[PDB]
Amino acid sequence: GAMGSMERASLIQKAKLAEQAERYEDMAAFMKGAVEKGEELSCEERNLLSVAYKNVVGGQRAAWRVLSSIEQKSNEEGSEEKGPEVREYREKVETELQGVCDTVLGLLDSHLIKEAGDAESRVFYLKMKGDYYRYLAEVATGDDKKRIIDSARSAYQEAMDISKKEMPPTNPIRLGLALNFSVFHYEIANSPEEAISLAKTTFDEAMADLHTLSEDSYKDSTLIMQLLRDNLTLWT
Amino acid sequence: GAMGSMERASLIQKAKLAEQAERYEDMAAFMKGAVEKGEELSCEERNLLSVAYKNVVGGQRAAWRVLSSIEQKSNEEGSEEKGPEVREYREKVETELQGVCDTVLGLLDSHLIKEAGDAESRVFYLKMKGDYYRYLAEVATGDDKKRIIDSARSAYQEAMDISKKEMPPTNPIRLGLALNFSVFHYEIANSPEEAISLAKTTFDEAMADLHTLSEDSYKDSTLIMQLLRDNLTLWT
Amino acid sequence: FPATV
Amino acid sequence: FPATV
Ligand SMILES: C=CC(C)(C)OC[C@H]1O[C@H](O[C@@H]2C3=C([C@H](C)COC(C)=O)C[C@H](O)[C@]3(C)/C=C3/[C@@H](COC)CC[C@H]3[C@@H](C)[C@H]2O)[C@H](O)[C@@H](O)[C@@H]1O
Ligand SMILES: C=CC(C)(C)OC[C@H]1O[C@H](O[C@@H]2C3=C([C@H](C)COC(C)=O)C[C@H](O)[C@]3(C)/C=C3/[C@@H](COC)CC[C@H]3[C@@H](C)[C@H]2O)[C@H](O)[C@@H](O)[C@@H]1O
Ligand SMILES: [Mg+2]
Ligand SMILES: [Mg+2]
Ligand SMILES: [Mg+2]
Ligand SMILES: [Mg+2]
Ligand SMILES: [Mg+2]
Ligand SMILES: [Mg+2]
Fold first, then answer.
1. Which atom belonging to ligand 1 lies closest to the Cα atom of A125?
2. DSSP 3-state helix, strand, coil percentages of chain B (rounded to 5)?
3. What span, in angstroms and rounded, lies between the C-alpha atoms of B55 and B61?
4. Which atom of ligand 2 is nearest to the CA of B219?
5. Domain with B209 in it: what CATH number?
6. Which of A33, A58, A38 lies closest to B89 in space, CA to CA?
């Protein structure tokens, strides 16, 4: 690893600098280096890892969507043939996106998930595993799509089961997991009713637990509760 | 070159796709490939080249400024020692930025400037040469700063001399050159009076030539004239 | 697109 | 920062 010669603490420090500079590729590379030191990540460090890769793959997804839309228009009736270039460049972006997803899933499998015993960390990493399989599913077409979808579902489901047993309904990780699993149901798994049911049940049970939620998590949890409401408004 | 096997037309097509997807690193790499085919760039192609690298280096500059500010704070009285990491990461970004500037200056020198005979193209490339030496000057500290500044000035000045002889005062390239050379004077060369004089003279002479300017260039030229006014308002 | 976190 | 194009 190109980060093998750097101190773990220095990698964490530089990941925080990269975040301030909105250099998310660097941020992800520093956090990958930190993970590869072999020690568990703290709560704050987990958030650096997730934000870095969320932003890298988020930009790739946005670009992939632009290109896929151009490609689909280029394949409509009456559209002029322009050659292989749109497909080629969409494939280039897609392959880069898949590579980043594979990198994240590899970190989770080697060895973040296996060593995570506290509910917070275990749910956090399994949510990430579902997220990155979901991003693989967004671009999957061949004999692989159904297994990729199943892998996303399996990771989200294990996270869900742990979160409901070990976390209060207002826990931000629990809430964010439910938000994203509900989007998985709506956008990936062709299950809008399950998506709506999950979002509503999650929102309602969090509302009833707010009379105990922290001022620390309030803004995160209210943000996510509002995102659940936003999605329900989009869907109904 | 990794683009050596791709058709020139395909490189141009993909640069336009990359622009639509806001993938400016890819856009710059496609345009570098196109330049290296050895043919002159058209007017539209020159704009793709300049926008791609302007956006790549623009992001590097923004990140460099964030890090340099943290570094300067870390070197104030009463600031706690945190080790070499801020300097190291600022240097990393700086070296990447310098590399992109060197790449652009190399393209201009091999062989865009030498083959550009029409005023539009010659001024365009010399403006770019001044811009990328200016970005090198923004980060230069050692025995090199004065020569870098002089290289920027020399390129801007040759462009200026051609633009005043061969272009109307409202030509967008002429206007944008004057805008950027005025910023060079203010921010790089410690010559705020020259910066203000150039901006005002440029603005006033363009105002008096608008009764002939095109509807094609109007929005570009009025935009740039407004940017000249904006800078004058900042400076006076 | 719907919101995720 | 001042404006450039
Ligand atoms: C990169 C790190 C920096 C910028 C320092 O911290 C980012 C945020 O991390 C914490 O929020 C977390 C967090 C976010 C909050 C919802 C942001 O809520 C506000 C008001 O902004 C969005 C981020 O994607 C992150 C790290 C991710 C997740 C999901 C991760 O699933 C793998 C699960 C829910 C949520 C949890 C972990 C939130 O607890 C702080 O509580 C916030 O203050 C802070 O902004
Ligand atoms: C990437 C290419 C795409 C997006 C297709 O085109 C970008 C823009 O290129 C043209 O503008 C030019 C142009 C800009 C205009 C000022 C944008 O004015 C508006 C109303 O937006 C900003 C760009 O940095 C660019 C390419 C650069 C320059 C400087 C280049 O110095 C080396 C000199 C002045 C100016 C000239 C060349 C402008 O003529 C069109 O006239 C615009 O319509 C169009 O937006
Ligand atoms: Mg060590
Ligand atoms: Mg593919
Ligand atoms: Mg249920
Ligand atoms: Mg050919
Ligand atoms: Mg240096
Ligand atoms: Mg003069």
1. 32
2. 80, 0, 20
3. 10
4. 20
5. 1.20.190.20
6. A33
